[model samples]
Target: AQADIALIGLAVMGQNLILNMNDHGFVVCAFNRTVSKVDDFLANEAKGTKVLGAHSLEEMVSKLKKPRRIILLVKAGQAVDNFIEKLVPLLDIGDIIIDGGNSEYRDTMRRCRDLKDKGILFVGSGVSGGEDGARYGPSLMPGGNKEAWPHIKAIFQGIAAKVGTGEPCCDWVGDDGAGHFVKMVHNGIEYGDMQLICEAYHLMKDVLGLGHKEMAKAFEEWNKTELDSFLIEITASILKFQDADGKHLLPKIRDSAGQKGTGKWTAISALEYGVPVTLIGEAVFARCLSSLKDERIQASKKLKGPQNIPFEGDKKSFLEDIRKALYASKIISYAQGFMLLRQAATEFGWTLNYGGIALMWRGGCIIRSVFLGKIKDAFDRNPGLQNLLLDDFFKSAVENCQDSWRRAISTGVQAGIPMPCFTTALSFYDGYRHAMLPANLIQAQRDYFGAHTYELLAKPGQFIHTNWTGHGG
Candidate 1:
């Protein structure tokens, strides 16, 4: 009558995860709001596995052993709250409740506090990878309620994706919604990745006048090098796919892009924290720009760009320059992302393992790649390393790519191609490398108008104000 653990919600993700747990020899009791789903899954695909189904929440709770553990794989927001409320009194003290959904970390934090008061432990886990990932293995970022970890560690790690070295892509992220927060950042970086790829595609198709076949070949070639990643691999795959008529399908698809809006959350958080997460910010804004389809269509007639520009660069060498442009911008994107993570640890009071985060991202996740291995190496080399750009490997990488990176962006500017992320990334790199900016003039302007005191170059901390308008003061 008792199961090792139970899961609520029998959606595709939940069903597949339940299957994953069962494959690993864990007894799972599955439940759903609609009781028929539980029975259907139990009798159908769930057969030949140690999966039990219950008609009611009470029945599911009763079937579990003491210190009952439950995994909630449902929709985020109020749906999560409803489950927490319904399940709280049904179980005994010290039981665990894990929310494996795309939830706002703030909401997770509140639930963590509310559940702790009721003698129940709460975990907000970020389960990446779609339906396929859940069925096979997913990168799991579980945080909050340290007490709950020991109870759930085995099953969590058991079902997680493994790397080449045979380590699971699952980790105890940190306390108070850190897992969800990290996941949000992950999604934000994913946005930057997609945008960068799209810009590259635009450069190939629009600027270079390359056909779908040539562009697909370019992505395929890049996938074999440092640009090798799940996103890159998938991009190449998507390009190669054709419809029944055998015509390229990409051109027929809508140009407007839709978002899940989590990227905006990261952008807003960056603004609040005053971190220049430029690539992500530009990426989110790019999606926004993409969404204004009708306005863009009308303005396409009104707005004039230098059209019919001839491709004057060396064709073969310029292709490699485009590759360098993408790589350098990508480096800037990750560097900006880590800057946010570093600041987040201090502000949120979470002791995030930077290297472990990289490892979790190394596989299973959408951004999985050979690049994350280097990220882990960077953190391993210097646990206190400040920025990814400061690392020896990446530093030299950007140095080598800079000349080509500049040429690529300059050519885009001259050709009037909109490369928001690429330009912003280069701008960030340039500003970061600069020892002094025009901020001295900005400070002088502030003091001249508003009497905001300025720190002199001679002595750093002394705030001095001079009356620029001698007659006024």
Candidate 2:
């Protein structure tokens, strides 16, 4: 009856987290709706530890210390709502309920406000990294009721990933649903990264006609570049892996992509906030386009392109241009991601720590990279950085690489390779740097047809309209 915290799900994430807490010297009570999971977890993963088990919600609540902290690793959506409803009646006032699943941010905000009226503390936390990261340490993003942080900070931060500076990858994201929002952005950025890498890989394969082994070696070398990341490392391993027959396995796998909807959520939020996350938007579209395999097959037969021309260029220098292109496009994606987050903060009324967000992503996340460490440094230097492209390091990096990036994209274009993410990123970079856009024509068109007001360039704060048809409306 004295467990420090109680968790009401015994899934992989739940079981791994219990072990992590035990390793950090915290007594955790494990429970599950199917009581056998609790017993099985104790006898196996939780064996020989201070971990406790409970079959019923009442028993779980009874075993926890006062002001009880409870974490839910159950499925997101209605399942989370169901568990919260069941636990509310069994818990006392001031007790805490934390949702660690990937629930919608708006839902988390709703639950937080609703639970507050019942005198309960609600936390929406974002746990990143996969199964391996869970067993070791994961990046934790916690938001919602601030009152519960003081009670759970030790366990949350204690079980999180740490960087070389001994800083935990867990931090207070913001109030309400900011944690989930950030996690959504993280997944969006991950999609952009993977798309960029695939484009680079395809350029090597389609353009250079390289084999899997050669591509694997190239990826290994790229890992040492500024694009160093867990995703990059794993891609190299995936390429190098062989099947039982000793042939490349990736070539046999289906080309269609799968998604859990987080990337789509990021794009939706960007649209809502009027933030142009062009790369992520294109990344999602790329997945959709990939899913249209049959259509692509038909189009491949019908479509015409510059297919007869050969790549009679310096192979080494072209690959190097691709590397710089990858880096430059990566900077654009991150800059867009942070811009979306910044807009979300203003629209959602959350005070997000942009620097801390970069720090938390430095390690233990799918997007973990030396690139993120540079992001943290940029933010630390100027928290008010307008965009990542504006930072000295990133600005110089893009400037030096722009020529190469343009060349690489031009090569892809000439080859008729549809690199949506890379192309969109370049488009965003150019559009962002432009002080004046063609919106003036759009405004004029709207005003002429719909009689909508148009702003005057010379007369500040003046809305002017002109009679284009010279006839009565």
Candidate 3:
């Protein structure tokens, strides 16, 4: 195998990643199911590599050396499985396979085990840092057999985006699909984080009636402080881009949101693992709610819409407070994200570096935020730290903003503005923080009706159903 790496699929992202590796002095064989994409990938001299374009699976496999390394950047589900079936017979023992698609983690795990059973090395890697990230550097999450790491680590590490000075976000996350799981959870967190920012923007614009310049300035200042990240920084610029009438463009944009399966996968997997991520779960629902454009129209026919309220008392001070509260809720959201990862790490025995994950996210990814620095610092200060909020600094930052989050939620409710995800996340946070929860009443009802178990706080007891309804006809 003369080629250092074989990259399957010349999709926009994959093509750019190959170019990135090429720029870093690696000879790559870039192939696509479509020949034109392969041609386009090799067209540019400056961005080109010692690349061989193969028209078929046989030709591509022939280009590789013994115990070959092949990276698959393909569609998930049937497409991936079909391709793998063909490749398995052709591939030899000690050969490495990396799947860089946004696959379900469980599927990745299964694939890894299946391949490993046959003496093949399979890794389910999560590749982030979109097209630009691919062209420059990407956050790579490699999960599979430990024996496979030595062969592929250099390739991934070399191509991964650097954080701060010399840190590459790429790590051998764990064995058996852990990288994909982390990536799935990361996407879930990304969803919550983005939605919360949008909610905050709605507050600043709809509630406070702030314009783009004001919003831009506020976020700009926030960036300088702690709310900084790639998303926040870009959002600041987004706030500044004006129309012909010089109104904020974001306002004109649709309130609707969209998503892929990663968010749902995270939530479903959490349920399977008994790890609760209310914030991320709410975010997935929030995106779904946003997509109900038709339902909104029908609902509007029966119900009146909200009346705009005035931002009256202590405006400047209130705005700052709101920003702080938003940051706090967001911190909790990320805390939950890492907590899920921690759960998985413990369950599977993966020595994952929480700080390294945060560092990779800072530079090239969409969900990048200033808060990641805190994550990095938290992990650095205490590698064994259980959660993000357990840190002294996060606790301090959250304390002052606590009341504001509650107040904001109350205000939204009073105004009849539905912020489903935001409210759910807030309530979840509050409920979790409390020593005594008020869920016993609901539990008792469930117990009385269906023999479902209920926990009593005053005394240690599990109550089953009495199966009696009072005053039945």
Candidate 4:
């Protein structure tokens, strides 16, 4: 019998996804570049399954039915392009290709255009939720040739995580690169969430002198509250873990954080679109900063910081304050993420469903949380809501958190703990809410130096020039 879909690349992710499709009762033909891996996978992993293993691209293409649907889980960039080039000649017109990789969106956009001109359908899909998520259910964001959606939607939805609404954590994102772009932003938010959690943990551990178990207990408690999330739950588990020698594994781990450039892409896209995703931007910079371990070690020995001082506040009150600050910062980060997405939608001329995006992210993905439901509700109430800061629910949330957030930030700064995400989020919130800022002086400085001109506050959009020094030179 012909398979419903063919999955290329039998790496861990690809293998797991193929098994997931099989679990959903869809016949899947699997392939790998090395024929030996394909043989091994079928013998070991696919031993009990009805999954068919193909030795070559020709055999794989032949195993699929008419209007073939092939999912690519290979390396991003040229590898994807190379595969498409090879597959195009073997397949007939109207055949569909789905790229389920962390590819750059522009590459997806180009591939979509190129494939469309060839009378083929190309989908740039973002599949998140790592290894287990792949074997079970994951968040799937597929966009590109809308025509192919109906034919493939069943299989995509069937294997996706289902939330409280009974809606799968999968959706039709938009044309061209929208799916990958949204995924990029999702990863950027993931980076911000991780850094924010680390900062909170650091404050508790280094400043408050809490042990690993104590910090883990705090995180476990936070997990039951508004700060509940996959990242937080994992962090709690990570902290409580011990080595074979009974030593805390966390201390033995390196301080340096590794990244794969999705956060950088998100920051660059934000800059290009003129959206200030300060929290994410700082999160990316924080990773970059963490990479300079040698310089930091040398500087630490040379430069003197404030002496270690005991935190004078009540421990219970301070921990509660940390939770409030974390929740507030997270709201700001998501606000910034959504703002960038809105900007991208306008720029790309895509009709993006903001609430749908939020709903789809409520499970499977690393950034999934209960708070996403609130975001969806906000957008549902006001589809035209310009900024999340203006949303009634989020506005009240920030308002309630302001005092505690401020105290936490002040304590961090005074105690010599770096709070990049928290500080940047607070700044973004403050700057966003201000009706008027000191940009007048900025405009004046620009006009005086470079003839950039300044706008009159009284008469908006009316540009005027001023000779502050009365010197044209």
- Ranking according to lDDT, highest score first: 4, 2, 1, 3
lDDT of each: 0.91, 0.92, 0.80, 0.93
Q: For candidate 3, what is the TM-score? A: 0.91
Write candidate 3's Cα lDDT for 129-216 as tens digits.
8898888988888888778889887888898877777878787888887888888887998888788877788777777778778888
On lDDT, who's better, 1 or 3?
A: 1
Alpha-carbon RMSD, candidate 3: 2.9
Backbone clashes, each candidate:
0, 0, 6, 0
Least well predicted 10-residue stretch by lDDT in candidate 2: 303-312
lDDT (Cα, tens digit) per residue for candidate 1, span 1-473: 47889999889999999999999988899999988998789779897788888888999998887779999988899999999989987878899999998899999999999999999999999999898999999999999899999999999999999999999999899997999999999999999999999988988877788888888899999999899999999898888889889987888898788988689999998999999999999999999998899999999999888866799877777788889999999999999999999898999898889999999899889999999999999999997899999899999999999999998888888888899999999989989889999888999999999999999788999999888888565
Q: What's the TM-score of each model vs. the native?
A: 0.98, 0.98, 0.91, 0.98
lDDT of 1 at 253: 92
Would you give me the overall lDDT of model 3?
Answer: 0.80
> How many collisions between residues are there in candidate 3?
6
**True-structure lDDT of candidate 4:** 0.93
